[PDB]
């Protein structure tokens, strides 16, 4: 079943991704991510559709030490992975394991972003059919 | 298959939980987390025997902000779920996933703590299970 649903069909839509702007301050920054309390995050360059890496909240931890260094994005800024939203999801689950990441940038055939997806998502699925499954 | 496995099966042992004590500093508390990279911790007071609580590591960001209150971990500290060592898997499975919480201490029949378990472990038996 797995092998059948695309990432298009299990991603969080564009509209609803929460971003980052790459020169917004870091109380700015914080407050998106309490608020929304995600752990991982596009970051932007003026608009979705340009994404510069992804910010893992955890990466701010080593900036709270009282004698560490001032928390820049360019120093916590990672790369971010790009997939077709074509790609089946079978094969995006043994990607996210065996490259070891849990979220990907979702593009459409156009090139656009289209939205986010993770490993999380597809756990979902996979537990959800458990639960389907059994309220049968 | 979940039904006939044991929360002592999957376990994390006692001796390998990465814990935090309830008097610690925000900079301890950082060195071990940071370390351990882990998101969730238990939170001790003299042994690993008595825990007082969790600790999510996310919950120290609001004390990152440019004007916020000082750190002290009863304001952070959260309450511990408990499951004894017999839980079917399943079912632990179930309260995971209804009360929508991740982490468990383990307990055996004297009351002493024996481990914790995740639902990442379970979801890992699951994913194994598929590939
Ligand atoms: N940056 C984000 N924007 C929108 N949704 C997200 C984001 N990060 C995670 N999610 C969604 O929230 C779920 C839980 O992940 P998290 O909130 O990071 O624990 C994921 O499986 C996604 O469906
Ligand atoms: N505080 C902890 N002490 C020991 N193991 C943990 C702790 N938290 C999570 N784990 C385990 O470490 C692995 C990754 O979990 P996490 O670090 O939460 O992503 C899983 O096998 C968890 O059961």
């Given at each position: 079943?797995?092998?059948?649903?695309?990432?298009?069909?299990?991603?969080?839509?564009?509209?609803?991704?929460?971003?980052?702007?790459?020169?917004?301050?870091?109380?700015?920054?914080?407050?998106?991510?309490?608020?929304?309390?995600?752990?991982?995050?596009?970051?932007?360059?003026?608009?979705?559709?340009?994404?510069?890496?992804?910010?893992?909240?955890?990466?701010?931890?080593?900036?709270?030490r009282?004698?560490?260094?001032?928390?820049?994005?360019?120093?916590?800024?990672?790369?971010?992975?790009?997939?077709?939203?074509?790609?089946?999801?079978?094969?995006?689950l043994?990607?996210?394991?065996?490259?070891?990441?849990?979220?990907?940038?979702?593009?459409?055939?156009?090139?656009?972003?289209?939205?986010?997806?993770?490993?999380?998502?597809i756990?979902?699925?996979?537990?959800?059919?458990?639960?389907?499954?059994?309220?049968?």
């Amino acid at each position: 079943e797995l092998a059948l649903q695309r990432v298009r069909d299990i991603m969080i839509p564009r509209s609803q991704m929460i971003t980052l702007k790459r020169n917004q301050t870091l109380d700015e920054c914080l407050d998106v991510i309490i608020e929304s309390a995600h752990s991982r995050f596009p970051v932007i360059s003026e608009d979705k559709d340009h994404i510069e890496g992804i910010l893992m909240a955890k990466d701010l931890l080593p900036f709270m030490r009282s004698d560490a260094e001032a928390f820049s994005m360019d120093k916590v800024l990672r790369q971010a992975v790009v997939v077709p939203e074509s790609k089946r999801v079978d094969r995006m689950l043994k990607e996210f394991r065996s490259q070891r990441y849990h979220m990907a940038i979702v593009i459409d055939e156009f090139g656009g972003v289209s939205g986010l997806v993770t490993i999380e998502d597809i756990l979902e699925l996979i537990v959800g059919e458990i639960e389907k499954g059994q309220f049968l």
